[PDB]
A paper describes a structure:
Human Epidermal growth factor Receptor 4 (HER4 or ERBB4) carries out essential functions in the development and maintenance of the cardiovascular and nervous systems. HER4 activation is regulated by a diverse group of extracellular ligands including the neuregulin (NRG) family and betacellulin (BTC), which promote HER4 homodimerization or heterodimerization with other HER receptors. Important cardiovascular functions of HER4 are exerted via heterodimerization with its close homolog and orphan receptor, HER2. Here, we report cryo-EM structures of near full-length HER2/HER4 heterodimers and full-length HER4 homodimers bound to NRG1β and BTC.
Author numbering:
A (entry chain A): 26 to 172, 175 to 179, 183 to 597, 604 to 634
B (entry chain B): 24 to 120, 135 to 602, 613 to 629
C (entry chain C): 177 to 202, 205 to 228
The structure:
């Protein structure tokens, strides 16, 4: 369906006008469905904009401002959903599109297919050379009129004698089609003729070819496999014949305005829908490898707000005023973003720079559900020792195609992400880190969940330069690489380990403490038993049950330093197993027989 | 209001003397009949004015064996046909013969499913004047129609005021109004010959205008006057933030309408609908006082104790010696109970012995029934229903012949018992032909019922004069003579104190009997070690810590039977003190 | 060009070397002109070449 994302710049631009045109091409060329905004600003009058003809729908707003071109080639644009509005008011805004000191500017709109706007108003203002913005019945296009919708040029002429008088241009091929204000009284939606029989389906937005939920030009609410519907088919159907709720077949999962058979692995399954986070009345659980959510019991784990979610919905970066919200957090529900205005302060506002000591609050975070976006870091922090216990990131929200993004940090020489084990979805982008040494050693397919994931590495410190005249991975470290220097920064090791540190051998028969190898990670056995001499094994496994020799007496299967006497009494030998006492012992016990009660 | 229907088909009334009272209580003052509308075996001159309110029937309409000249259903607009008579017909008029003269169904414009069956009605004129194809629905044109021409009355000519001679009766007001066959478009229903007379796709039974608020009847769901295809969901999915969120406009689905909360006996389900049964892997939870909802099992669900009409017992006639053991240890039964002849007698064809009084004791633990309780036979050695004395609630979600939740027919009972019973959730109570039953007239039945359309119907029980002639009356120690039976245990509400489930005048504080301390309506014994002095505190309280005097081994902070083995021993005054050796 | 330079009290609006401009008339609204390395509505973050 050729989906692309909006720019979110508003009126601001690059200072070089040719690069502003080239960026517009890179964002929207060959795209059909725009998520976010369609924003066209400061384009020169000689530039070719015919690449915009493929656009069919815009989810946010359409903004056209300060341009010098004559014509908008948006002949296929049908619907503007308006789920974000310009200045929180306008879904379509067109203004100031002419040169103050010349004859250049916007002359015709070309918007013949534009049939509805679901939310917000229309703003047309000060377009000195624009014809046919007026004479358009904008109340047919806007779904919720407010008798917003401001319209305000001469010498444009009558459209054509054969036209109804509502028109986008200078000929009869540009006449506006009315679809809602010229209808039979019985209709809820829009029409394909003036008769009660040429009325179309209530769930279809911006016009129809026929009366069915298959026969629609664009859909509002959900697209169920080519039919447009109020909600996806559910796991149960109500039976008003019997007052019972009956199990249903063909039930589909709701996912981002589509109905699907399988919910993607990044999202939580809840009541036949895929969600980024579960509501506060319930708890997120995993069963059979599937993420899902069930009612909360006792005290449930809670995730903290990320940048762009919850109480931080308005935040652009971690900064000196919002960083305190992360002090006791173990999971972030949203993105974690570090921009220049957050790290070094924002003098236009009251927010000062972050003291590097404050960043230590993120040492308790194990999961980030959105992407990690690092574009600024304090001048002399040489690594990411903050996040050393971070386990997994991303896959529910991405920045473009990325879950991990590190741009242009010159003070950093190593990463040191000790605990990072998996990235559930999205790509990795690490560039321009001219002093970063270890990056070239990492085997990144061990962190990815699928064969569809990729990593972009370029323009960092040369791998041959740092290898020859710089730092390398520890001698115990495997071919999968290391995050930084030493025995505790390696992704996976040869020999053995204890905690985060890789080692040659595990003190099974030699040392002030004694262990059992237990596969790759070595563990201590119960200290109440003996530590063996002459190179002999101390324990066969964990617990007092697995000791090879005992320095004290015993009970049952194991070595025992103290037996539970005085409970009831129980007798113990100094060098043999403990014995049950004779009945009716009241002061102490010397054994299991009649004279042993003290 | 909304009322339910009988589903008796053509069977004889259980109590012919009270059949008109059953029909008046079920149908008086309601607009919508859920289930069937069944009017059968009515006597000559029966007063039927209470039927004039009905506009909608959700099942079929059955009119059979009646001796009335007319049935006042002229306001009826739509029959939905969600159940059909003999699996084929939505409207059936049978054997009404001195019999029905006219149908008079002036407002009827929709039959959504099934046919029309009219047979053996000698006096019934105007059966073959009606254009039945205008009444059947466009998408459900089964049209199975049987009409009987064998009329004994001479028909009066159809009024000249009726353009098509389509009379339902002799009056100028009896002319059929056509809503399908008179329009040139594809419109399911319309109000005139013009294209502008066509009305909204969701309207049924005709229209007063082109909008979805102009319907005479609603095809799918009536949203508080606005006619709609689905009830608004309680939870809505945000297409852009990928999260479920509450809907401030959301409604529960209930039958063919949308509501903000469901009626008293219905079980609320979290998907946005109200049901008589809970979905698989869910529990019933009384989350708030006076209501109930389904909640999901977080771990594998506990055993559910089923009764008659559900699961493996859904085809079973009655409780018998072959299946009674399945109720062992049950406090709540999901289903109904029925005790019939051949429950308390044998069946040589089923190799099954009769139930004994010692086997009925399996129900001693029972506190709640989800369906109905029907008893038409009972052992002659049991004077009451005391085997059900702990029964608190009969919900009535399933009713005997669609009408009765509590039924007692022809039994040897002297008094009802059932003293724990607090609620009859739904349905009528029917008690008749019990020649020895006395205390049915002293039970506070208006306290057990929970809405309109509920009543006690009774006949042929022991006359009140024969109860008084033998001194059979409520005990004096309880409110206003409200009793379930004779003696101090069968009182509803004691005026003083309750001891061992008996009402009593005195709370044993100063009496020669083993002494008891006072509570709000109850009396409880002193600890035996405490001295029974004449002071109101000295012996008295729920722990020895309240006692002031002690018979022996007195530990200064409280009275005990023996000094505890720090060890203690009794001193020269009989009080406990620490031992020199522990 | 329908734009003027913003006042010294508000020139801090643009970050990362961006220049601050105001629209000639009304409420009023502002824009930044970014260097070729930065984007966003007031030059908050980097341009990516992919
Ligand atoms: C994360 O959020 C918590 C709130 O949940 C914030 O608050 C507490 O912070 C302290 C210090 O960091 C945490 O650790 C403990 O601090 C105690 C300080 O003394 C105060 O608290 C005790 C509470 O009983 C009072 O008696 C006392 O008068 C003071 O008011 C120490 O007492 C604790 O250790 C010592 O005492 C215990 C006593 O059992 C001994 O076992 C120890 O050996 C030792 O001698 C301990 O250091 C504390 O847990 C937090 N409390 C809560 C409610 O959880 C954090 O500041 C906040 N920030 C982060 C990220 O830490
Ligand atoms: C923008 O407005 C245009 C009108 O200016 C609007 O119309 C589309 O026009 C194209 C042709 O330019 C139609 O093309 C279809 O292409 C297929 C495949 O080649 C053909 O099979 C179709 O033609 C036949 O079959 C149709 C079956 O329904 C018949 O209706 C038709 O008479 C032919 O026999 C057809 O040419 C295209 O179908 C229309 N659009 C629609 C919705 O019909 C276009 O919709 C507007 N832009 C957008 C993106 O909505
Ligand atoms: C002492 O050291 C032992 C190794 O030398 C430790 O290992 C063994 O641990 C198990 C318990 O985990 C003991 O009990 C047995 O448990 C298995 C469990 O079955 C499941 O796991 C195995 C793989 O481990 C898998 O093959 C199965 O399909 C199951 O999924 C049971 O099958 C047995 O019946 C039994 O209960 C072992 O006895 C024990 N090993 C030995 C040699 O005893 C042991 O835990 C250490 N500590 C102690 C207290 O013994
Ligand atoms: C409801 O969803 C269905 C998909 O489930 C939509 O149909 C799809 O429409 C897209 C539109 O881009 C089609 O992709 C296009 O295919 C043509 C093939 O010639 C190609 O030239 C375009 O570049 C583009 O890739 C896609 O094939 C089509 N899928 C199917 C199964 O027909 C449909 O439009 C949705 N309806 C509404 C009203 O939203
Ligand atoms: C980077 O890590 C990936 C895993 O994420 C490594 O891929 C693995 O490659 C080995 C062989 O080196 C595969 O094992 C076996 O290889 C033999 C041939 O030597 C073959 O006959 C067996 O059928 C089997 O494939 C292993 O399955 C494969 N894993 C995956 C998930 O594809 C890769 O080698 C690592 N690179 C380095 C140099 O660290
Ligand atoms: C010694 O090493 C063995 C492996 O060679 C360890 O046994 C494994 O222990 C892990 C937990 O550390 C078990 O996995 C987890 O089990 C939970 C059960 O609820 C499950 O939710 C997790 O997804 C995960 O599967 C693993 O099952 C177990 N393996 C076997 C065969 O039992 C053992 O823990 C080590 N002992 C010591 C002292 O460290
Ligand atoms: C949809 O359901 C609503 C109720 O939720 C129905 O509205 C009810 O309309 C009837 C008349 O058809 C009203 O009864 C009349 O009330 C007046 C009150 O002055 C009285 O004078 C009349 O004798 C008669 O009793 C009834 O009050 C009204 N209920 C409410 C709550 O407004 C409506 O008819 C249903 N629509 C369809 C198409 O079935
Ligand atoms: C029937 O049951 C009710 C409880 O449902 C019994 O409790 C209540 O008893 C009091 C006293 O007889 C009734 O009157 C009020 O008593 C308080 C006592 O402090 C007094 O302050 C008030 O001025 C008033 O006299 C009360 O109404 C009653 N409860 C209810 C809900 O009616 C009642 O004793 C039982 N009746 C018999 C005769 O068993
Ligand atoms: C109306 O009465 C006629 C008789 O007057 C019935 O018609 C008879 O039906 C039987 C059925 O076995 C045939 O054998 C006869 O030949 C029929 N007689 C005539 C005169 O046609 C008819 O069934 C009656 N209709 C109803 C609805 O009862
Ligand atoms: C509680 O009161 C009873 C009387 O109701 C007391 O018992 C009486 O004790 C006197 C002692 O001289 C005897 O003469 C009476 O014959 C007793 N009467 C009865 C009914 O037995 C008893 O002593 C009182 N107890 C206390 C703690 O004072
Ligand atoms: C390093 O950063 C700290 C932050 O407190 C600062 O005080 C110090 O002057 C910096 N030193 C250098 C050499 O960058
Ligand atoms: C290796 O990198 C260091 C970084 O300081 C640089 O001085 C040196 O010239 C580099 N050597 C080569 C061969 O590029
Ligand atoms: C019906 O009432 C009429 C008087 O209106 C009377 O003549 C007739 O006997 C009554 N029929 C019966 C069976 O009560």
């Amino acid at each position: 369906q050729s989906v692309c994302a909006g720019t979110e710049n508003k009126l601001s631009s690059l200072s070089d006008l040719e690069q502003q045109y080239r960026a517009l091409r890179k964002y929207y060329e060959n795209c059909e469905v725009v998520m976010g905004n369609l924003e066209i600003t400061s384009i020169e009058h000689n530039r070719d904009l015919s690449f915009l003809r493929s656009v069919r729908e815009v989810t946010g707003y359409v903004l056209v401002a300060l341009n010098q071109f004559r014509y908008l080639p948006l002949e296929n644009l049908r619907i503007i959903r308006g789920t974000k509005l310009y200045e929180d008011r306008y879904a379509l805004a067109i203004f100031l599109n002419y040169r103050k000191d010349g004859n250049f500017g916007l002359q015709e709109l070309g918007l013949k297919n534009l049939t509805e706007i679901l939310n917000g108003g229309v703003y047309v203002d000060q377009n000195k050379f624009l014809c046919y913005a007026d004479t358009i019945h904008w109340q047919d296009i806007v779904r919720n009129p407010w008798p917003l919708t401001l319209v305000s040029s001469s010498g444009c002429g009558r459209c054509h004698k054969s036209c109804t008088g509502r028109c986008w241009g200078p000929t009869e091929n540009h006449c506006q089609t009315l679809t809602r204000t010229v209808c039979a009284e019985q209709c809820d939606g829009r029409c394909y003729g003036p008769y009660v029989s040429d009325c179309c389906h209530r769930e279809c937005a911006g016009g129809c070819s026929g009366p069915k939920d298959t026969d629609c030009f664009a859909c509002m609410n959900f697209n169920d496999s080519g039919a447009c519907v109020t909600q996806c088919p559910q796991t149960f159907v109500y039976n008003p014949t019997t007052f019972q709720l009956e199990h249903n077949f063909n039930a589909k999962y709701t996912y981002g305005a589509f109905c699907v058979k399988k919910c993607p692995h990044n999202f939580v399954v809840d009541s036949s829908s895929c969600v980024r986070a579960c509501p506060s009345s319930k708890m997120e659980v995993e069963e059979n490898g599937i993420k899902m959510c069930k009612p909360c019991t006792d005290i449930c784990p809670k995730a903290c707000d990320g940048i762009g979610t919850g109480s931080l919905m308005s935040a652009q970066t971690v900064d000196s005023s919002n960083i305190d919200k992360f002090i006791n957090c173990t999971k972030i529900n949203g993105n974690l973003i570090f921009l220049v205005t957050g790290i070094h302060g924002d003098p236009y506002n009251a927010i000062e720079a972050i003291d590097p000591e404050k960043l230590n609050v993120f040492r308790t975070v194990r999961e980030i559900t959105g992407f990690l976006n690092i574009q600024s870091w304090p001048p002399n922090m040489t690594d990411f020792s903050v996040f050393s216990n971070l386990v997994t990131i991303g896959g529910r929200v991405l920045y473009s195609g990325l879950s991990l993004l590190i741009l242009k940090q010159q003070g950093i020489t190593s990463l040191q992400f000790q605990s990072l084990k998996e990235i559930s979805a999205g790509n990795i982008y690490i560039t321009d880190n001219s002093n970063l040494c270890y990056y070239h050693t990492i085997n990144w397919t061990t962190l990815f969940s699928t064969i569809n994931q990729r990593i972009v590495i370029r323009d960092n410190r040369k791998a041959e330069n740092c290898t020859a005249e710089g730092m390398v991975c520890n001698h115990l470290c495997s071919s999968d690489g290391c995050w930084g220097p030493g025995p505790d920064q390696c992704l996976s090791c040869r020999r053995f380990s204890r905690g985060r540190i890789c080692i040659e051998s595990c003190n099974l028969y030699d040392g002030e403490f004694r262990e059992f190898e237990n596969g790759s990670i070595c563990v201590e056995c119960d200290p109440q038993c003996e530590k063996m001499e002459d190179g002999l094994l101390t324990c066969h496994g964990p617990g007092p049950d697995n000791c090879t020799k005992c320095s004290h007496f015993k009970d049952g299967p194991n070595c025992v330093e103290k037996c539970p006497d005085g409970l009831i009494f129980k007798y113990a030998d100094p060098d043999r197993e403990c014995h049950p006492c004779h009945p009716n012992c009241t002061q102490g016990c010397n054994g299991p027989t009649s004279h042993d009660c003290i | 209001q909304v009322c339910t229907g009988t589903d008796m088909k053509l069977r004889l009334p259980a109590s012919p003397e009270t059949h008109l009272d059953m029909l008046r209580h079920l149908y008086q003052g309601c607009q919508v009949v859920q289930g069937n509308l069944e009017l059968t075996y009515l006597p000559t001159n029966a007063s039927l004015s209470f039927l004039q309110d009905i506009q909608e029937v959700q099942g079929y309409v059955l009119i059979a064996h009646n001796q009335v000249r007319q049935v006042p259903l002229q306001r009826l607009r739509i029959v939905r046909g969600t159940q059909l008579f003999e699996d084929n017909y939505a409207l059936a008029v049978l054997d009404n013969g001195g019999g029905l003269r006219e149908l008079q169904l002036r407002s009827l414009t929709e039959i959504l499913k099934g046919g029309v069956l009219i047979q053996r009605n000698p006096q019934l004129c105007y059966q073959d004047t009606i254009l039945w194809k205008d009444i059947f629905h466009k998408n459900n044109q089964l049209a199975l129609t049987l009409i009987d021409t064998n009329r004994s009355r001479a028909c009066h000519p159809c009024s000249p005021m009726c353009k098509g001679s389509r009379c339902w009766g002799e009056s100028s007001e009896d002319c059929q109004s056509l809503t399908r066959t008179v329009c040139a478009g594809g419109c399911a229903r319309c109000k005139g010959p013009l294209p502008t007379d066509c009305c909204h796709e969701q309207c049924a039974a005709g229209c007063t205008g082109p909008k979805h608020s102009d319907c005479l009847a609603c095809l799918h769901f009536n949203h508080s006057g606005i006619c709609e295809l689905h009830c608004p969901a309680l939870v809505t999915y945000n297409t852009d933030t990928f999260e479920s969120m509450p809907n401030p406009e959301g409604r529960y689905t209930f039958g063919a309408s949308c509501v903000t909360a469901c009626p008293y006996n219905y079980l609320s389900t979290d998907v946005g609908s109200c049901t008589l049964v809970c979905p698989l892997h869910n529990q019933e939870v009384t989350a708030e006082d006076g209501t109930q909802r389904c909640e999901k099992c977080s771990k594998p669900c506990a055993r559910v104790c089923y009764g008659l009409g559900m699961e493996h017992l859904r085809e079973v006639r009655a409780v018998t010696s072959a299946n009674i053991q399945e109720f062992a240890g049950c406090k709540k039964i999901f289903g109904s109970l029925a005790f019939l002849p051949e429950s308390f007698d044998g069946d040589p064809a089923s190799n099954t012995a009769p139930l004994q009084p010692e086997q009925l004791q399996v129900f001693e633990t029972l506190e709640e029934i989800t369906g109905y309780l029907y008893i038409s036979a009972w052992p002659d050695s049991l004077p009451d229903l005391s085997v059900f004395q702990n029964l608190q609630v009969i919900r009535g979600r399933i009713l005997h012949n669609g009408a009765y939740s509590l039924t007692l027919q022809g039994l040897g009972i002297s008094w009802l018992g059932l003293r724990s019973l607090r609620e009859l959730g739904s349905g009528l109570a029917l008690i008749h032909h019990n020649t020895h039953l006395c205390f049915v007239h002293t039970v506070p039945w208006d306290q057990l019922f929970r809405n309109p359309h509920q009543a006690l119907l009774h006949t042929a029980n022991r006359p009140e004069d024969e109860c008084v002639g033998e001194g059979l009356a409520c005990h004096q120690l309880c409110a206003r003579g409200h009793c379930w039976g004779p003696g101090p245990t069968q009182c509803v509400n004691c005026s003083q104190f309750l001891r061992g489930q008996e009402c009593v005048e005195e709370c044993r504080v100063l009496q020669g009997l083993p002494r008891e301390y006072v509570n709000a309506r109850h009396c409880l014994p002193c600890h035996p070690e405490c001295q029974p002095q004449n002071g109101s505190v000295t012996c008295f309280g729920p722990e020895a810590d309240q006692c002031v005097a002690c018979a022996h081994y007195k530990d200064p902070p409280f009275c005990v039977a023996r000094c505890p083995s720090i060890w203690k021993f009794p001193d020269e005054e009989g009080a406990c003190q620490p031992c020199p050796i522990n | 060009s329908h734009l003027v330079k913003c006042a010294e009290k508000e020139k801090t609006f643009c970050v990362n070397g961006g220049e601050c401009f105001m629209v000639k008339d009304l409420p009023s609204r502002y824009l930044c002109k970014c260097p070729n390395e930065f984007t966003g509505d007031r030059c908050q973050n980097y341009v990516m070449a992919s």
